[PDB]
Amino acid sequence: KIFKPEELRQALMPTLEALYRQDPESLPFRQPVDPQLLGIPDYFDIVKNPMDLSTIKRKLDTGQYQEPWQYVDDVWLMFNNAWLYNRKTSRVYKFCSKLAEVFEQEIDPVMQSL
Ligand SMILES: CC(=O)N1CCc2c(c(N3CCCc4cc(-c5cnn(C)c5)c(C(F)F)cc43)nn2C2CCOCC2)C1
Numbered sequence: 192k193i194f195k196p197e198e199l200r201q202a203l204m205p206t207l208e209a210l211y212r213q214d215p216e217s218l219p220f221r222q223p224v225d226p227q228l229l230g231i232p233d234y235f236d237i238v239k240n241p242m243d244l245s246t247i248k249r250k251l252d253t254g255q256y257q258e259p260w261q262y263v264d265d266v267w268l269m270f271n272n273a274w275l276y277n278r279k280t281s282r283v284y285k286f287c288s289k290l291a292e293v294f295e296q297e298i299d300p301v302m303q304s305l
Pocket of ligand 1: 218219224229231272273276282283
């Protein structure tokens with residue numbers, strides 16, 4: 192099956208908005224990590240493929256996903272980066288785990304619909 196860009200935007204953007212709606216848990220993920228601003232200069236030594244909500248939103252808006260699993264892969268890349276980099280006790284790690292729970296719930300019926 193071939194997916195049209197607007198078909199993917201209509202189906203998948205509500206699942207991304209559900210992540211943005213999470214406060215405080217989406218706040219670390221709304222913009223690309225800025226290591227110098229945050230004072231964490233080792234970040235890019237650990238995380239080789241950064242990803243965040245704003246970049247996913249732009250990719251959906253500009254038709255960069257041909258198939259829904261590419262979108263799912265980027266959302267999970269964002270999660271995996273945060274579980275890799277941050278300590279298990281940290282806000283960003285526990286907030287990431289919450290976003291993963293919300294995403295799992297939202298994406299499943301959408302994928303069934305296609
Ligand atoms: C996604 C990822 O891996 N980041 C790398 C580490 C990281 C990120 C962030 N970010 C990115 C910028 C926005 C932001 C906002 C919040 C927030 C929540 N509730 N409120 C009211 C605000 C939090 C959360 F912590 F309070 C973290 C971050 N900080 N950190 C480290 C946090 C500890 O000091 C060093 C920086 C993003």
